[PDB]
């Protein structure tokens, strides 16, 4: 019985590790940040379109 | 999408008012440029 419990635990942990890059909050959070930085930059570029065109 | 659109489309009374503006801006730039050259030396 004890072996069976630990075996299940192991199986569960293995499944979680294999799918962490797309599922875990930590990794997903990093991707969000990178995307927000670029958004802001593009907003700025669009706001100064006239000046940039003139240049 | 908005950027690509702007890139494709845009990036890829006496008549005396405009003369004053031009002369003013051009003269100012000229001042600053010469001062910078002097400072470098």
Tell me, yes or no, if B12 comes closer than 8 A to chain A by beta carbon: no
What is the spatial distance between Cα B31 and Cα B33, in angstroms, rounded to a whole number? 5
Identify the experimental approach. cryo-EM
**How far apart (Å, rounded) are the C-alpha atoms in residues B40 and B34?**
10
CA distance A33 to chain B (A): 20
Cβ distance A45 to B3 under 8 Å? yes
| Distance, first Cα to last Cα, chain B | 48
| Candidate from B2, B3, B11 with C-beta closest to A53 | B11
- In angstroms, rounded to a whole number, what is the distance separating the alpha carbons of residues A21 and A1? 33
Residue of B3, B10, B11 lying closest to A42 (CB–CB): B3
Counting Cα atoms < 13 Å in the Cβ hemisphere of B22 gives 4
């Amino acid at each position: 019985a004890e072996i069976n419990q630990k075996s299940l635990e192991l199986e569960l942990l293995r499944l979680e590790k294999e799918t962490a890059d797309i599922t875990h909050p930590l990794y997903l959070g990093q991707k969000h940040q990178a995307l927000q930085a670029m958004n802001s930059h593009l907003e700025a570029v669009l706001r100064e379109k006239r000046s940039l065109r003139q240049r | 999408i908005a950027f690509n659109q702007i890139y494709a489309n845009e990036f890829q009374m006496s008549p005396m008012g405009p003369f004053f503006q031009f002369v003013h801006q051009s003269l100012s730039t000229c001042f600053k440029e010469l001062e910078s050259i002097a400072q470098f030396t």
